[PDB]
Write a protein that binds this ligand. Structure first.
Ligand SMILES: NC(=O)C1=CN([C@@H]2O[C@H](COP(=O)(O)OP(=O)(O)OC[C@H]3O[C@@H](n4cnc5c(N)ncnc54)[C@H](OP(=O)(O)O)[C@@H]3O)[C@@H](O)[C@H]2O)C=CC1
Ligand code: SF4
Ligand SMILES: [Zn+2]
Lengths: 117, 80, 483, 123, 68, 170, 331
């Protein structure tokens, strides 16, 4: 909440906005730059301004983790992420996944994890 | 305080200096155990002595000179 | 892994450090950070290969850097005005007043030749040649001649190792120190028919070693045992010496045996090559030994009052006096910055127009890939102003005037990257013999390993987290074991 | 486009150094004659002899060129800038390019020694 | 303008025959999160502000002294 | 004086004086909103779109916009098209001879931050460096719908001008 | 493009914040000083934050009106100039506007009373209200400005209250740096040349013999910025006077010799002079003040114990050198 503004003075934003996301409070990159660094950087152009109507764009690392890990009967899985309603070519391109190791395996585009069974 | 000099490893115009450091170092290091020598070479130079004193101030002389004792004349001159 | 992408990159041909060979590399940089390094091809020095530690070292080059000068308050550093640091240096100089043999100047492993010129100029215009290396047993001369460049260089060619016959290592792991050399060794050993001996630490080579002992008496037994015949027999052998024996105080008799043998055998000491071959752990102590970076016998005695750190991470609390003025000048935060009174952010090997000398003796330009970040500056430019706040007037202000001053110290360092041989073989070996003759009494100290770990040295492998996680995975692990 | 503008000449290359020198002398006379017109036209803050002591020192910059033909391109560029200033073609913003040093006294800490270069790492 | 819902905003500028109340749910893009609809807040203190998403390139060194 | 006082973005009329001043302000801002006279500055690919607003699909006369191409009668200026080094003093001079309740709007993507010519040599890197621009109209063919929307954005700013309420110094 | 602003590159401020001016000093560069200028839409403030943002110090601009705030955007790059609204009344806006400011100045001085502000309001009370929060936030290099002839004494209530504000700035956050400039002249100054440029009457008292030495405004701004950043300015009163003392007859004759016109002269005494200025307060556009009457009998009382232009290596210009430029378009 109260973070030091390089002078001992503290700036005070609510805990609803000391967040990486509405889905996650913690960072997910080595150079993610948490919001606690960001308001610490330029609150200069943040004063007299609303805190609500910025993006908060629902970060993906929480949403991908609660998708069900699918199962594949054979050996090599295929991932597209393409819909079967959309008349076109969407989704990520047709890469294949070897699933042999113990544990699931995320398709490196879509992040859906597959398991051999 | 220090001293250095430089030859060219080609056998031209540094040969009396070359034989000077072939022979006279075993006497000159014992003659001056306080100060320090060092030798380097760069495939063509003018043969030249640079010595540094008890200030950091240095002095120099260029050795287009005849024989080993003719080197030693300039060296003894350059020390004082 | 995914940080940039090879059309975004600015490429810059330059030189590797933290390696005795000084391999010809290329820096890939986005423009602020340093993305990666890739070995540009060169025939002699690396044959288009590069050390592992040389490869992944860019992580510490961007994570723990000194970005501003920090002055000690007393158990606390605060950063301060760039004037205030150097003015504190001049003020505490007026307080302490080292009038001679009390201004310790120590440089480190990855430090510039061009910077150490400024160092030596400053110290001896100051009036004290307390000018010592970082190494333990560096507080004297390194038990051999600073004269006769052959005493501290690699006298055969690295290309001559293809023509090598039968050699022996002492006190070293050349798999660790200069792994590029080990690549050359294994290529030679597979190609021709060779014989290697190894005296000292028991190492795991890629090739076939033949151990002889762990004592200088065992060494002296081995020289007169069978290889006095072999090295006399051998056509183009050599004999190879690591720098870790410089740590041992019994180095001189350790030289006096081997300095006799090169003198005794004319096969190892002929005209067109010289068999005495030594290495360093750094890319710079060879260049420092070109500078004349050695204390005197008189300068080895007095405990200083004003210690000058220039890199030089591996000092201890024992190596430093109590009340000493210990201003660090470096690039990142290591042990050397931890003891300090004032730290000075100097640029690392990337950001500056460096000049380096390997163990072969190649003077090579390090083209600057980027600017010094934050508030770091170039090193010799800092030493110029440090002179100015004292009475010392350095006669230069540019780079070209430094290049002429460097030409004054040795013209072989402005004549870049061209290896000359030494016409002084026998006189050089004899003068290496006469100095430490007799006065060194060799004990039975076992020839232990020079370094603790490979991937933890030189203030960057400790700075980089990737070499911390490299270090943990690499000791006798069940995935790193063989059987 | 048969006909030229008012002061524009057909470009022609003098074969001798002396004929070039004659043209440059006439040219400096043309600048020096048209100089009080410029302070009216470009509405400048300062005085006419400052214009004149610039027009002198700009030719002092190129007094010591050896070649005939490099002085020929130099003369042609000078004649074109005369052609611009004698009309309304440059504007006073573009006219005041020629006095950066006059309009503002530089500022505090103009670096002179090594140290003032060094403390701002040569600006 | 831009106070309208997107799937309508298409149809207001005549992108579709079928307004989104009559589209099949197969053409509904399935989402795993709720929706908020910020229209635009230009000049209003709810205006968008920018910042670089990532930290500075080179982290500094923290002062850790060492009493000898 | 009170230590707490409502911000002028947050204040409401409570005195009958304030009702009078607010309605008078509304009349002044309203005549400023309806009658609306820009000046034809447009010069490049960003000027045909200015004429496309005058076209009979997206009319501006029904908005009251009309191009009195004479900067002394102009309320605002629409910087449109790219902006070169060679022109820019003329842009400053045209800004100079405008009456005081003025604005200027940056139609076109070259007109703010250089646009497609951000790295050219003879170009001003957006008309920020010359005149103080209050609304940008993005779009490299900045859409007639978008240009009109920029005008409506500016007219909302005109509704919040508060020329009368500031005599009470709120 | 060089930093002619600073002395150096790396500056820790007095409050302990680290500031590193990266880049080469131009408009695109950044210096690092977060500055705040109260009342920056005023005539000193435009020239002030122009030079202050010329080297890319981040200038927090508090404004009062939404129209006059706009023509200060052009002197800064992205993020350099910023804007936020405030009243002198609402203390939370003062509190907000100075939270990250390294340095801060207040050129708030109004020569006439409104029906909502008097001299006691906007000189001694509001300055207390703002520098209280300066003391609350440990803001470095606080600068306060007062006028010339800023006494404790009566005869100009303006000048009576300016010294009161000085004493309040000396009282709380007591190291605050006080500057008193001379009369000022610039292109469209407030009441000193444009009032003398066109005037249907040109009447004032004293028979035109009050004495001062006016300073060109850009010299005041350069002087202020050269104050802003170094040491050896803290808690020091600053007389900033022009090179040579003038009289009003001398000034007006120097104006009229370049105009080559008959500037009118009436110079009627004080009694009928006062009551006409009494009735002008009810008019919303600003007129000559009934308390500006009193300063006409006053002159430049220079304190000898202060620090001049030559403290900070500056020589301002002389008014006779500038007279052709400034009232040129009235020819
Ligand atoms: N020759 C001279 O004129 C002399 C003047 N001074 C002082 O220098 C400073 C600047 O000089 P000058 O440019 O001529 O005068 P200004 O035009 O700057 O004075 C008015 C400025 O201060 C603001 N101001 C006044 N009262 C308030 C208030 N309640 N709330 C918010 N802002 C207020 C004004 O706000 P807004 O922008 O909305 O109008 C405006 O910015 C002044 O303080 C002046 O007293 C000192 C010596 C000589
Ligand atoms: S906005 Fe587009 S069409 Fe207009 S000037 Fe820029 S690039 Fe050209
Ligand atoms: Zn996928």
């Amino acid at each position: 909440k109260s973070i030091i503004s390089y002078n001992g003075n503290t700036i005070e934003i609510p805990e609803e906005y000391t967040k990486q996301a509405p889905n996650r409070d913690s960072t997910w990159a080595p150079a993610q730059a948490s919001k606690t660094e960001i308001y610490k950087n330029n609150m200069v152009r943040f004063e007299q301004k609303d805190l609500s109507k910025q993006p908060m764009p629902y970060a993906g690392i929480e949403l991908i983790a609660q998708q069900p890990v699918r199962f594949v009967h054979g050996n090599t899985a295929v991932c597209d992420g393409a819909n079967h309603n959309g008349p076109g070519a969407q989704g990520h391109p047709k890469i294949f996944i070897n699933v042999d190791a113990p544990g699931s395996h995320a398709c490196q585009y879509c992040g859906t994890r597959y398991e051999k069974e | 305080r220090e001293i250095r000099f430089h030859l060219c490893q080609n056998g031209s115009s540094s040969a009396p200096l070359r034989q000077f450091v072939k022979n006279q170092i075993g006497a000159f290091q014992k003659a001056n155990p306080s100060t320090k020598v060092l030798v380097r070479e760069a495939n063509g130079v003018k043969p030249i002595v640079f010595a540094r004193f008890d200030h950091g101030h240095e002095s120099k002389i260029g050795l287009d000179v005849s024989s080993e004792k003719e080197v030693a004349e300039r060296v003894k001159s350059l020390i004082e | 892994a995914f940080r940039a992408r090879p059309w975004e990159l600015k490429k810059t041909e330059s030189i590797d450090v933290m390696d005795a060979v000084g391999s010809n590399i290329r820096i890939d940089s986005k423009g602020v950070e340093v993305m990666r390094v890739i070995p540009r091809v060169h025939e002699d020095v690396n044959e288009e290969w590069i050390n592992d530690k040389s490869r992944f070292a860019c992580d510490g080059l961007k994570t723990q850097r000194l970005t501003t000068p920090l002055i000690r308050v007393g158990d606390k550093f605060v950063n301060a005005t760039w004037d205030d640091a150097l003015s504190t240096i001049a003020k505490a100089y007026q307080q302490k007043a080292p009038k001679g043999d009390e201004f310790k100047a120590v440089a480190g492993a990855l430090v510039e030749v061009e910077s150490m010129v400024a160092l030596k100029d400053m110290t001896n215009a100051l009036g004290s040649e307390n000018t010592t290396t970082d190494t333990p047993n560096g507080n004297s001369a390194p038990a051999h001649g600073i004269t006769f460049r052959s005493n501290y260089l690699f006298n055969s060619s690295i290309a001559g190792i293809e023509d090598a016959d039968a050699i022996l290592l002492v006190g070293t792991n050349p798999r660790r120190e200069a792994a590029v050399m080990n690549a050359r060794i294994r290529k030679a050993w597979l190609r021709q028919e060779l014989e290697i001996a190894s005296v000292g630490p028991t190492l795991d080579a890629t090739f076939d070693v033949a151990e002889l002992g762990n004592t200088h008496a065992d060494l002296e037994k081995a020289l007169s045992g069978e290889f006095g015949e072999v090295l006399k027999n051998a056509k183009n052998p050599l004999i190879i010496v690591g720098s870790g024996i410089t740590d041992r105080e019994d180095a001189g008799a350790f030289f006096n045996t081997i300095g006799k043998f090169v003198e005794s055998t004319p096969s190892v000491l002929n005209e067109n090559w010289n068999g005495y071959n030594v290495l360093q752990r750094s890319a710079s102590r060879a260049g420092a030994y070109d500078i004349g970076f050695t204390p005197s016998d008189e300068a080895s005695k007095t405990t200083p009052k004003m210690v000058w750190l220039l890199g030089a991470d591996e000092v201890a609390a024992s190596d430093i006096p109590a009340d000493a003025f210990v201003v660090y000048q470096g690039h990142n935060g290591d042990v050397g910055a931890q003891f300090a009174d004032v730290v000075l952010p100097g640029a690392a090997y990337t950001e500056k127009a460096g000049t380096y000398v390997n163990t072969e003796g190649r003077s090579q330009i390090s083209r600057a890939a980027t600017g010094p970040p934050g508030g770091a500056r170039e090193d010799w430019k800092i030493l110029r102003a440090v002179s100015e706040y004292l009475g010392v007037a350095l006669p230069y202000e540019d780079a070209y005037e430094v290049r002429d001053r460097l030409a004054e110290i040795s013209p072989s360092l402005v004549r870049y990257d061209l290896v000359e041989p030494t016409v002084f073989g026998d006189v050089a070996v004899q003068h290496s013999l006469v100095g430490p003759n007799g006065s060194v009494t060799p004990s039975s100290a076992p020839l232990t390993e020079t370094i603790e770990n490979f991937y933890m040295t030189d203030s960057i492998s400790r700075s980089s987290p990737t070499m911390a996680k490299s270090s943990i995975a690499f000791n006798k692990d069940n995935k790193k074991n063989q059987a | 486009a048969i006909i030229a503008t008012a002061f524009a000449e057909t470009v022609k290359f003098s074969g001798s150094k002396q004929e070039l020198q004659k043209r440059t002398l006439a040219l400096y006379r043309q600048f020096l004659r048209g100089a009080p017109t410029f302070a009216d036209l470009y509405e400048v803050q300062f005085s006419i002899p400052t214009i004149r002591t610039k027009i002198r020192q700009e030719f002092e910059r190129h007094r010591f060129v050896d070649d005939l033909s490099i002085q020929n391109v130099l003369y042609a560029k000078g004649h074109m800038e005369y052609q611009e200033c004698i009309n309304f073609w440059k504007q006073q913003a573009q006219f005041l390019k020629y006095f950066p040093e006059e309009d503002d006294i530089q500022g505090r800490h103009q670096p002179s020694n090594f140290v003032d270069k060094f403390l701002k790492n040569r600006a | 303008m831009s106070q309208v819902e997107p799937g309508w905003h298409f149809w207001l500028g005549y992108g579709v025959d079928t307004a989104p109340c009559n589209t099949p749910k197969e053409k509904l893009p399935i989402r795993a999160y709720p929706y908020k609809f910020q229209p635009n807040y230009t000049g209003t203190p709810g205006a968008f502000v920018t910042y670089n998403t990532l930290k500075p390139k080179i982290s500094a060194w923290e002062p850790v002294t060492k009493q000898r | 004086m009170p230590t707490d006082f409502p911000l002028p973005s947050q204040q409401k009329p409570n005195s009958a004086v304030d009702y009078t001043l607010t309605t008078l302000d509304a009349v002044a801002n309203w005549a400023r909103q309806g009658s609306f006279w820009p000046v034809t500055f447009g010069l490049a690919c960003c000027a045909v779109e200015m004429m496309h607003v005058s076209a009979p699909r997206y009319d501006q006369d029904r908005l009251g916009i009309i191009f009195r191409a004479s900067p002394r009668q102009s309320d605002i200026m629409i910087v449109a098209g790219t902006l070169t080094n060679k022109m820019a003093p003329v842009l400053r001079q045209v800004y100079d001879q405008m009456p005081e309740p003025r604005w200027v709007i940056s139609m076109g993507s070259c007109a703010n931050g250089g646009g497609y010519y951000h790295f050219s040599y003879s170009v001003v890197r957006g008309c920020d460096r010359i005149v103080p621009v209050d609304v940008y109209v993005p779009g490299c063919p900045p859409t007639s719908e978008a240009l009109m929307y920029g005008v409506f954005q500016l007219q909302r700013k005109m509704r919040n001008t508060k020329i009368t309420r500031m005599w009470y110094r709120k | 493009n060089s930093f002619e602003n600073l002395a150096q590159d790396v500056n820790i401020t007095r409050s302990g914040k680290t500031l590193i001016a990266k880049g080469t000093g131009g408009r695109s560069s950044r210096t690092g000083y977060t500055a705040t200028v109260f009342g920056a839409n005023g005539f000193l403030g435009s020239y002030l934050t122009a030079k202050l943002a010329k080297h890319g110090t981040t200038v927090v601009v508090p404004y009062r009106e939404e129209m006059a705030k706009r023509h200060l955007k052009v002197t800064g790059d992205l993020g350099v100039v910023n804007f936020l609204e405030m009243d002198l009344r609402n203390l939370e806006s003062i509190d907000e506007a100075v939270r990250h400011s390294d340095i801060v100045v207040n050129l708030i001085g109004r020569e006439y009373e409104t029906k909502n502000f008097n001299y006691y309001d906007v000189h001694v009370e509001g300055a207390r209200r703002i520098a209280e929060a300066v003391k609350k936030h440990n803001i470095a290099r606080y600068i306060h400005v007062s006028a010339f002839n800023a006494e404790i004494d009566s005869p100009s209530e303006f000048n009576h209250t300016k010294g009161l504000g000085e004493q309040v700035t000396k009282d709380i956050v007591p190291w605050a740096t006080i500057v008193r400039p001379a009369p000022m002249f610039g292109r469209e100054d407030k009441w000193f040349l444009d009032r003398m440029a066109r005037s249907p009457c040109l009447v004032s008292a004293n028979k035109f013999q009050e004495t001062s030495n006016p300073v060109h405004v850009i010299d005041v701004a350069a002087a202020l910025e050269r104050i802003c950043f170094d040491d050896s300015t803290v808690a020091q009163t600053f007389e900033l006077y022009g090179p040579q003392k003038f009289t009003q007859k001398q000034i007006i004759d120097m104006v009229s010799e370049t105009l080559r016109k008959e500037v009118r002269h009436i110079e009627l005494p004080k009694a009928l002079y006062q009551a006409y200025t009494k009735a002008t307060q009810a008019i919303w556009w600003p007129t000559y003040s009934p308390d500006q009457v009193e300063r006409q009998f006053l002159s430049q009382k220079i304190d000898p114990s202060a620090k001049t232009f030559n403290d900070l290596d500056l020589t301002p210009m002389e008014l006779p050198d500038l007279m052709f430029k400034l009232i040129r378009p009235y020819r």
